[PDB]
A paper describes a structure:
Contrary to most organisms in which three enzymes compose the 2-oxoglutarate dehydrogenase complex (ODH), actinobacteria rely on a two-in-one protein (OdhA) in which both the oxidative decarboxylation and succinyl transferase steps are carried out by the same polypeptide. Here we describe high-resolution cryo-EM and crystallographic snapshots of representative enzymes from Mycobacterium smegmatis and Corynebacterium glutamicum, showing that OdhA is an 800-kDa homohexamer that assembles into a three-blade propeller shape. The obligate trimeric and dimeric states of the acyltransferase and dehydrogenase domains, respectively, are critical for maintaining the overall assembly, where both domains interact via subtle readjustments of their interfaces. Schematic illustration of the reaction steps involved in the oxidative decarboxylation of 2-oxoglutarate with generation of succinyl-CoA and NADH/H+ (ODH reaction), with emphasis on the catalytic steps catalyzed by OdhA. These include the ThDP-dependent decarboxylation of the 2-oxoglutarate substrate followed the reductive acylation of the lipoyl group provided by E2p (both catalyzed by the OdhA E1o domain), and the transfer of the succinyl moiety to the CoASH acceptor (catalyzed by the OdhA E2o domain).
Therefore, based on the MsKGD structure and on secondary structure predictions, we produced a truncated version of OdhA deprived of the flexible N-terminal segment (OdhAΔ97), which produced crystals diffracting up to 2.5 Å resolution. The single protomer shows the presence of an N-terminal acyltransferase (E2o) domain, spanning from the construct N-terminus to residue Asn349, connected by a 17-residue linker to the C-terminal, ThDP-dependent oxoglutarate dehydrogenase domain (E1o). In addition, a ThDP-Mg2+ cofactor is bound at the E1o domain dimeric interface, in an equivalent pose and active site environment as in the M. smegmatis E1o (MsKGDΔ360) high-resolution crystal structures. On the other hand, the E2o N-terminal domain shows the known, compact triangular trimeric conformation of the chloramphenicol acetyltransferase (CAT) family, characterized by an N-terminal β-strand that protrudes to make a strand exchange (mixed β-sheet) with the neighboring monomer. Furthermore, despite the overall conservation of the CAT fold, a notable difference between the OdhA succinyltransferase domain and other E2o domains resides in the β-harpin that normally lies close to the three-fold axis and is located on the inside surface of the cubic assembly, here replaced by a short α-helix (connected by flexible linkers) spanning residues 296-302.
Author numbering:
A (entry chain A): 293 to 563, 579 to 781
B (entry chain A): 100 to 207, 211 to 341
C (entry chain A): 100 to 194
């Protein structure tokens, strides 16, 4: 008949009574007692819950058993504030962003014990106790359970955000408030629209690999969520009343982008020259009355060389329209690979032009197709940065790391990144964490150099098939 | 369909045989939880005196065991048993209170019951010496056949491993078996801090059971016996 | 003195027959209360992952059941039984 807050102040825990009725001719009482002791120990054991979570594919560390901390001088409210800062700043380090259950050997791992409640002298016994949270979530007081659910929804699900390095208080608070408002529950209609784009992306990939020869180099298999990601951004820009989107990209997935994003007919695409030419098309929105031109820029095989050229194309088109400071209606959508983005110096050299008087174009939307490989080289030999997209922290720009096997989270990030660009006029970086299904070329076994990574890749469901089975299950 | 089959032999054959014979005793069990706080405190005062004097340590089973003897003397029906004498149902009233201690022996594990004889004429120091004599000789294999016979009442401690309470079996020839359970706090308090529990006033407990032959001992008598044990564990004269 | 009388038949006759045979097994019971707080918390984390992924829900009996198997492997005597083989008392160790 007691209240949950009064019981939480004492520290009353739930119990289970277990009995053992045994044949005394072959089992003695001491053995039966030891058996029940082991069961009690197991139900509060670290290894036991690690084994269950591993089996059920829960990509989080379980709650740990601990004794309720004794009442010394230590204040818990100021330590709840320190935990809130830790999640805002580094919560992306434990976010479900990798579609593979893969940790690259060779890459150093930063310590993030500050994300565990035990480091701030708080235990499971504090979950239903109330604390002062200093205006967090627009509230003065909150329970630690409510603090953790809000922090987990905002920063540890399929989107890992990096934004606290932003200096301006107004821009940093806008991102904070939108990320802590949460990712909206998608409607059934929205879910069917995403399923149609994924069907189109995979149908095209299967046509290319089976009807043409020597296309394994150019496969988008493992990164098919790029199609609804680019569509989301271009569609959001059309709703903002903008005039054109200029794309700069390498070879991977280029013909897929030409058919499903630019809108060229199949006859026009098929008549490696096509992989370097430019094109023009139109994008109409299904749920609106906006239109937007979509262009693709020509480029050589030298990766990232299109970056400065593409920015210049955008600036010339903006100057011809001449709509002033509140204009900037030609959106640059620039695609990269993870190895090339981190390694080639032209990438940050071009981003340094983003706010300059003669080079400003209202910000660039960057998409890094992070397939955690570059030919036969893994990230441990490609960069000294934690994430591939870390040049963003140098320019005071936000980064959104999103799981390429959750298309709902991928379309949301596309929309938010395009909304951020129109409001603040700065660059935005999307790290699409995916994988590369085939080798770098036709005559290459990727297991020769990376056998452990390709144990997780070979024979898994595609993003389309996995998403259909996931919707049917829930 | 071929599991391992190994014949039960030796002392284990004797335990199994007695468990089969025990099926003829209609038993009932009484369960009572008792405040153990004063036991924790006063046992610590005795052990602190001994560590500063000539060593030695007394256990909770020594105290409960002595309280059990005082309780059997206050309620003598608990020391009686049933037997068929002259083809008739009869009540057996023993001459002495021979307390059988369930000692868990190492193998070359087996639980055997050795008796502390004539406990009704002993003070605590004589009871403690007699108890330690039985446990000492069992550890060095120097028990005789006379040590295993004449048991009138028994005491077992499943609480050492952490069992809350048990419903044990009663061996033929005795009227009751007493079981001592876990002296931890209940499970709902096992993750709590000592200062928060001290502010409410949560005390430690011990659950004691009484499994008795219903043909010669009634439930009300068994309940009164457990009440006297609880009263003794918090009594001024006892300590 | 006429109460309702109805013969016990089917599966219920089998349950009643086995309960009569069970009278030949001398049993004892051990009782232990265990902290369940961490079970409530960690079961909720697994079910929250499943509701967001492909559905399904795990129960407390699934967890306790698996803990019971780990405990029987740590204490194998709990998996043995008694039988009279060759007219002698014997210990049955299952495979
Ligand atoms: O049996 P015994 O004669 O009581 O004594 P043991 O040799 O088993 O004593 C070993 C430990 O078990 C503890 N113990 C024994 N019976 C117990 C019970 N029923 N509940 C809880 N702890 C118990 C004792 O307190 C002792 O711990 P401590 O001496 O550090 O305080
Ligand atoms: C400037 C330049 N240097 C080297 C190469 C050779 N090359 C072609 S693809 C490739 C690896 C690309 O890795 P990543 O950027 O991760 O792209 P992915 O193929 O994984 O999409 C390299 C080194 C190149 N094309 N351009
Ligand atoms: Mg790559």
């Amino acid at each position: 008949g007691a209240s949950e807050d009064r019981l939480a102040e004492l520290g009353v825990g739930k119990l289970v009574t277990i009995t053992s009725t045994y044949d005394h001719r072959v089992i003695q009482g001491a053995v039966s007692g030891e058996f029940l002791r082991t069961m009690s120990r197991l139900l509060t054991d670290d290894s036991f819950w690690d084994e269950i979570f591993d089996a059920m594919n829960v990509p989080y560390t379980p709650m740990r058993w601990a004794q309720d901390v004794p009442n010394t001088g230590v204040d818990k409210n100021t330590r709840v504030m320190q935990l809130i800062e830790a999640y805002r700043s580094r919560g992306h380090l434990i976010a479900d962003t990798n579609p593979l259950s893969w940790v690259q050997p060779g890459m150093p791992v930063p310590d993030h014990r500050d994300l565990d409640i035990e480091t701030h002298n708080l235990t499971i016994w504090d979950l239903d106790r109330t604390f002062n949270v200093g205006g967090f979530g627009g509230k003065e007081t909150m329970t630690l359970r409510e603090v953790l659910s809000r922090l987990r929804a905002a920063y540890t699900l399929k989107v890992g955000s990096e934004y606290t390095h932003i200096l301006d208080r107004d821009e940093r608070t806008w991102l904070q408030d939108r990320l802590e408002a949460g990712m909206p529950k998608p409607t059934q209609a929205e879910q069917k629209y995403i399923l149609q784009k994924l069907n189109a992306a995979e149908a095209f990939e299967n046509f290319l690999q089976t009807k043409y020869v020597g296309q394994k180099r150019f496969s988008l298999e493992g990164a098919e969520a790029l199609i609804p990601l680019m569509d989301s951004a271009i569609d959001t820009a059309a709703g903002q009343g903008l005039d054109e989107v200029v794309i700069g990209m390498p070879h991977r997935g280029r013909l897929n982008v030409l058919f499903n994003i630019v809108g060229k007919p199949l006859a026009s695409i098929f008549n490696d020259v096509k992989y370097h030419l430019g094109s023009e098309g139109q994008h109409l929105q299904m749920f609106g009355d906006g239109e937007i031109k979509v262009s693709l820029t020509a480029n050589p095989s030298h990766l990232e060389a299109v970056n400065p050229v593409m920015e210049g194309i955008v600036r010339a088109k903006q100057d011809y329209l001449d709509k002033g400071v509140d204009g900037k209606t030609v959106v640059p959508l620039l695609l990269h690979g993870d190895a090339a983005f981190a390694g080639l110096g032209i990438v940050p050299e071009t981003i340094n032009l983003a706010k300059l008087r003669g080079y400003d174009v209202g910000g660039t939307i960057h998409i890094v197709v992070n397939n955690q490989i570059g030919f036969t080289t893994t990230p441990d030999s490609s960069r000294s940065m934690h994430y591939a997209t870390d040049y963003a922290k140098a320019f005071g720009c936000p980064v959104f790391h999103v799981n390429g096997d959750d298309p709902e989270a991928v379309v949301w990030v596309g929309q938010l990144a395009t909304e951020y660009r129109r409001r603040f006029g700065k660059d935005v970086f999307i790290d699409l964490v995916c994988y590369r299904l085939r080798g770098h070329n036709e005559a290459d076994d990727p297991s020769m150099t990376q056998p452990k990574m390709y144990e997780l890749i070979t024979g898994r469901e595609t993003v389309r098939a996995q998403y259909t089975e996931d919707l049917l299950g829930r | 369909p071929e599991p391992g089959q190994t014949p039960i032999r030796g002392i284990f054959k004797s335990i199994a045989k007695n468990m089969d014979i025990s099926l003829e005793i209609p038993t009932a069990t009484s369960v009572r939880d008792m405040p153990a706080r004063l036991m924790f405190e006063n046992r610590a005062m005795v052990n602190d005196q001994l560590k500063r004097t000539r060593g030695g340590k007394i256990s909770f089973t020594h105290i409960i065991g002595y309280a059990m003897v005082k309780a059997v003397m206050a309620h003598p029906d608990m020391n009686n048993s049933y037997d068929v004498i002259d083809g008739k149902p009869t009540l057996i009233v023993p001459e002495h209170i021979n307390l059988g201690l369930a000692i868990d022996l190492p193998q070359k594990r087996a639980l055997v019951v050795a008796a502390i004889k004539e406990t009704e004429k002993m003070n605590f120091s004589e009871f403690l010496a007699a108890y330690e004599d039985i446990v000492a000789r069992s550890r060095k294999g120097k028990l005789t056949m006379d040590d295993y016979q004449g048991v009138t009442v028994s005491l077992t401690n499943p609480g050492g491993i952490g069992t809350r309470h048990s419903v044990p079996r009663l061996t033929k020839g005795q009227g009751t078996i007493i079981g001592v359970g876990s002296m931890d706090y209940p499970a709902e308090f096992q993750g709590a801090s000592e200062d928060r529990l001290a502010e409410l006033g949560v005390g430690k407990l011990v659950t004691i059971t009484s499994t008795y032959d219903h043909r010669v001992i009634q439930g009300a008598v068994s309940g009164e016996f457990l009440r006297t044990m609880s009263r003794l564990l918090t009594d001024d004269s006892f300590w």
